[PDB]
Design an enzyme around this catalytic site. Sequence first.
Site, short mmCIF file in Angstrom:
data_model
loop_
_atom_site.label_atom_id
_atom_site.label_comp_id
_atom_site.label_asym_id
_atom_site.label_seq_id
_atom_site.Cartn_x
_atom_site.Cartn_y
_atom_site.Cartn_z
N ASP B 153 0.80 -1.21 0.00
CA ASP B 153 0.00 0.00 0.00
C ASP B 153 0.82 1.24 0.00
OD1 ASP B 153 -2.49 1.33 -0.19
OD2 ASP B 153 -2.88 1.26 1.89
N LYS B 155 1.84 4.80 -0.78
CA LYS B 155 1.17 6.04 -1.22
C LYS B 155 1.52 7.18 -0.25
CE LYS B 155 -3.26 4.65 1.07
NZ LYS B 155 -4.72 4.38 0.90
N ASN B 158 0.47 7.27 3.42
CA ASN B 158 1.03 6.27 4.35
C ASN B 158 2.50 6.55 4.67
OD1 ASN B 158 -1.41 5.01 4.32
ND2 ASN B 158 -0.81 3.18 3.22
N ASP B 171 1.01 1.94 8.11
CA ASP B 171 -0.11 1.27 7.46
C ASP B 171 0.29 -0.07 6.85
OD1 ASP B 171 -2.95 2.76 7.21
OD2 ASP B 171 -1.43 4.21 7.45
N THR B 188 -4.49 0.50 -3.23
CA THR B 188 -5.24 1.73 -3.51
C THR B 188 -5.30 1.93 -5.03
OG1 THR B 188 -4.50 2.73 -1.38
CG2 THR B 188 -5.40 4.22 -2.97
O1 LIG Z 1 -3.25 7.06 10.61
S1 LIG Z 1 -2.33 8.12 10.76
O2 LIG Z 1 -2.62 9.39 11.25
N1 LIG Z 1 -1.67 8.54 9.32
C1 LIG Z 1 -1.49 7.50 8.30
C2 LIG Z 1 -2.76 7.56 7.43
N2 LIG Z 1 -2.82 6.41 6.56
C3 LIG Z 1 -3.67 6.64 5.37
C4 LIG Z 1 -5.17 6.54 5.62
O3 LIG Z 1 -5.50 6.40 6.97
C5 LIG Z 1 -6.93 6.45 7.17
C6 LIG Z 1 -7.06 5.51 8.34
C7 LIG Z 1 -6.67 5.97 9.59
C8 LIG Z 1 -6.75 5.12 10.68
C9 LIG Z 1 -7.17 3.81 10.48
CL1 LIG Z 1 -7.29 2.72 11.79
C10 LIG Z 1 -7.53 3.35 9.21
C11 LIG Z 1 -7.46 4.20 8.14
C12 LIG Z 1 -1.01 7.34 11.62
C13 LIG Z 1 -0.97 5.96 11.63
C14 LIG Z 1 0.08 5.25 12.27
C15 LIG Z 1 1.04 5.93 12.95
C16 LIG Z 1 1.01 7.33 13.01
C17 LIG Z 1 2.02 8.04 13.71
N3 LIG Z 1 2.03 9.35 13.77
C18 LIG Z 1 1.07 10.08 13.17
C19 LIG Z 1 0.03 9.47 12.47
C20 LIG Z 1 -0.03 8.07 12.36
#
Ligand SMILES: O=S(=O)(NCCNCCOCc1ccc(Cl)cc1)c1cccc2cnccc12
Lengths: 20, 337
Positions: B153, B155, B158, B171, B188
């Site tokens: 994934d 992108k 992420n 992710d 995606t």
């Molecule tokens: O989720 S985050 O804010 N940013 C990554 C976003 N990924 C792309 C789409 O996410 C939508 C989404 C968010 C949460 C869940 Cl469970 C499903 C889909 C994030 C995840 C993991 C670790 C992080 C650490 N620091 C900041 C943000 C973090």
Amino acid sequence: TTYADFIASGRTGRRNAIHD
Amino acid sequence: SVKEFLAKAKEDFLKKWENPAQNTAHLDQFERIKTLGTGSFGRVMLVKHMETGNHYAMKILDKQKVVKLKQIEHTLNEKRILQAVNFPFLVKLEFSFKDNSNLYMVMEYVPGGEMFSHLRRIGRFSEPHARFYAAQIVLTFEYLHSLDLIYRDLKPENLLIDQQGYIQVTDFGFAKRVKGRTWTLCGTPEYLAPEIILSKGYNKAVDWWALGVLIYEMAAGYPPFFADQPIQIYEKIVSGKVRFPSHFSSDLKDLLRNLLQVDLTKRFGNLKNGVNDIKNHKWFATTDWIAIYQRKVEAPFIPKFKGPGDTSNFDDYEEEEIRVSINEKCGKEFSEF
Ligand SMILES: O=S(=O)(NCCNCCOCc1ccc(Cl)cc1)c1cccc2cnccc12
């Protein structure tokens, strides 16, 4: 322009993962 | 050297893979501050760990919703892989645990925000800027792939930008340890390799295609294949055609024609020379691969820092209660988590 077409599209925001 | 480093990284990984960490904290040890992101089966919240004062990003997955979306095995993959890996450009899983209702993965908080948001705002990245990020992905995939992991994934959404301007990949929800071929339709739309769309068995070469899409998007400001609806995107991806902006260098377009290659015998990353076909390309001639790994290269951009628990780089989301049922949901499905 290609940039303009993108900006006017519906997929300039965060894109969701897909699956089956 | 590379081979020797990867050899020992595999020893490290395999030990954790075969004996995963389990139940290393509890929800009551964290103060919940703000939602950072939201998904179909969960959300990620900024939290503070009371015992240390450290801020973390806590991913909370609703077990019932995971089951309904048929993502049980994918989620088990995610946590099992994340607790086992260790690499400078991967977000670190600090703790995991579960309760009656939810799964929890507490990861390192990266306050700089997603690449996605900086890229959209700025419009596009310069080739050097794009190259700096792309390098870190090349190394990350070299690492993950050596452990038999496919990421699936890639992108900008992420890829988090840390306080030194370097990438943290998050992710791992579609990440899978697989020798040989796999078949799940996931990813995606914009980033799917043609073989995923055409329901063929595929392998780690899909990540190298996805790198081509990312580099294109970073340098162009829009993806190589876009439309309003996923089906229209899939038609463009399988058509065998890509157009590059005027401003793309000749080297860049040549790297990209070799990554966005429908023919697997010809796609870079997949060939007899593997990742070295990418690393030794002309577009990367200036790149000092060891200094990137060591984070001794100066980043082209450092996110504005307004404190350790500031969320200004993230959008706002509607807050929703964290409910923990008095009855255990889905115990057997998630027994190993
Ligand atoms: O989720 S985050 O804010 N940013 C990554 C976003 N990924 C792309 C789409 O996410 C939508 C989404 C968010 C949460 C869940 Cl469970 C499903 C889909 C994030 C995840 C993991 C670790 C992080 C650490 N620091 C900041 C943000 C973090």
